[model samples]
Target chain A: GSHMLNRVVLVGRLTKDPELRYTPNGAAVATFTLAVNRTFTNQEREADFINCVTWRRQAENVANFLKKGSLAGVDGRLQTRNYENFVTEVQAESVQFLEP
Target chain B: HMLNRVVLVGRLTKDPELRYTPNGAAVATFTLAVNRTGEREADFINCVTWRRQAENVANFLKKGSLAGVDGRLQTRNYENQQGQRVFVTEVQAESVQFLE
Candidate 1:
């Protein structure tokens, strides 16, 4: 079968504390927003607010260690959701806290 | 101030298209299909490479070839032939590595 790849890496600050939840199966889930800045712009710097999610122990770690203004490096895959709006989100494979 | 990056390992969905801008800069575009772990599904992502990397991709890659792309997500808007505004999202690749 033909293979595919969809991955994203970002270093940004948390817009707020991560929201942690659990699935019916007891799996941990965390959701947060990352504010990433654009490179080499003319005027003031611009940023994109990206949605990100992570699961399991990583989810717990993200929620526990990260908060608003915390710096993080995210490695993940892009997942598109079509509901009321077509939203693209990062499903994180790893979330690294870059600074304390 | 912030970092935005992406890394993907996937198979090419089709042969790359290489075009030169009026300024003579090379632009290469392609689709990548990345499989989900433990699942039969995959994500189809659009990717673009510029300049030297663009020419390299066009010259060496083809459908079904595996590649590792390091890039960033870019969102842009343009008017269609029908005069309707359309928003397009794509990865702007900084480096592309041929895997197989």
Candidate 2:
């Protein structure tokens, strides 16, 4: 049997405060937007706004310690979900505060 | 002023394609099939490697080979044959590790 791997790492600043909520089963979930800049770009240093999510204790930690404009790094996997439209999101496994 | 990074491990869906730029810099491109947890389908991710890494990826990897890619997400725009602007998103890999 062959193994499959799915992972992603990102470093950026929170575009806004993380939104924390609980599932019906009382599991914690947090959602936030991260703004990551491109390297060696044109005159304007364009940035991409990416959606990210976290669960459980890590979810609580993200909501409690991280805030708008906070620098952080996320390691996760890309998940695609279909709502009204196809949405791609980062499912964060670990989040680190890069700055206080 | 900021940092952007991504890491992914997945199985190659096809053999990598290697090409050279105008200045003769090596470029390699491949697609990875990453399995999701609790899901039957896999995510097909496009990855690119440059320079010596590009040569190595093209020379050693093949279909079904496991590769760990460390990189960053990038967005580029190009014109389609129909003259419509198309936005492409891909991972520009800095390091490509052969897993199996």
Candidate 3:
């Protein structure tokens, strides 16, 4: 059967630095928001702010290596889940800090 | 509330299939499986390109080649002949390009 495709790609600077945290089991997790500009025009469009999460050793690297104003290329998938009172969604894949 | 996107740089599992819409517009559909370094093996993504871009993708691309997909996530709602409502989601590709 034929199906539709759902994928996204963005290259942008970090609006701010990432915040790193540890789970109860000691796994590292880093969370941040990326300010991705939509177009290269003067349209009155606010920059799309995306929530990103990185896990494990990569999570630690994201925290240690990336800083505010650093450019990165994020590769991830859109994930959505339902909580008790609200629906939560974010990018649920590892991020790569583009290195020259 | 407005960000739904994905990006992949991976080899196509197979060749792209070119087809036409009801209005005679060209469309190319393909499957790309992106590897997740620390998680599961790979995340299989479905993608589509349209019109001149579709022709360009099909002409220069082949199986086992890397591609860059840029698009928005979209879901469609429709009714079947049996009166069942269908919900489908896929990446509405705005651009497709080859990677070196």
Candidate 4:
């Protein structure tokens, strides 16, 4: 039996500051976009604008603690969703906060 | 919760194994020996799969086959039988893809 797991590890920098919001239940959710530049030059280094979300205490902590231009290490899962419009995008999951 | 994740293109070190938890959830586990682009040796990574993905991974993946992993890095603290706290780190795969 074989099990397939999807995981990613990246080292990159923040393009800008984080954006924070709250759910109806008062759960803190922070959304931040990251800029990932590939080492090898390919199409202007193509900064990968990635979206991330944090939850509850961790979410609030990330929003308040992190800032723009911060270098970071993110380890998380890739998630995909289908919408009514039949649109889909890959996302990261189980984000862990790393040090500067 | 950012999209700064790690992607690994590598070959399976062995065949994937499918198992079950007490909760009746199916789980699959496998190891991928990912070669660093320019490095001579490879990094052996542990990956996990669950539910339908687990079944799919087991059925489709084989030893020496190329795979792409999209997932997160996770570390957990636990007390071992010796009463000493131990840290366990591994990638929790959200998705796995076969590379041609």
Query: By DockQ, who's the top model here?
Result: 1
RMSD, model 3, all Cα superposed? Answer: 9.4
- The CAPRI quality class of candidate 3 comes to incorrect
Of 1 and 2, the candidate ahead on TM-score is: 1
B1-100: candidate 1 lDDT, tens digit per residue: 6778888888888999999999999999998777776333667778899999998898899998888789887665579899986655677899999953
Error in Å for residue B26 of model 2:
4.1
Of the true contacts between chains A and B, what fraction does model 3 have? 0.14
**Model 4, stretches more than 4 Å misplaced?**
A1-100, B1-4, B37-40
Candidate 2: CAPRI quality band: acceptable
lDDT of 4 by residue, B1-100 (tens): 2334556566788998998789988788887775433313335666777887787778889998877777654434479899986544445567877743
- Which digits, one per residue and each the tens of the lDDT, describe model 3 over residues A1-100? 1222334555667779989999988989987766666553453654555556778987888888988877776765654332342111245465667754
Model 2 bad stretches (over 4 Å): A1-7, A21-26, A38-44, A80-88, A98-100, B17-26, B36-42, B75-89
Off by over 4 Å in 1: A1-8, A78-88, A98-100, B38-40, B75-89
How far residue A57's Cα lies from its native spot in candidate 2, in Å, is 3.3
Q: Model 2, B59: alpha-carbon shift in Å?
A: 4.0
Tens-place lDDT per residue, model 3, B16-95, is: 99988899999998877666443345556567889988988788888987777887644444699999865444455678
CA shift of A5, model 1, Å: 7.1
**Per-residue lDDT for A1-100 in model 1, tens only?**
4445566788889999899999988999999988888786854776677788999999999989999999998998887654453446788999998987
The digit string of per-residue lDDT tens for model 2 on B1-100 reads: 4566777788888999999999999999998778765444767778889999999998899998889888877656569999986545578999999943
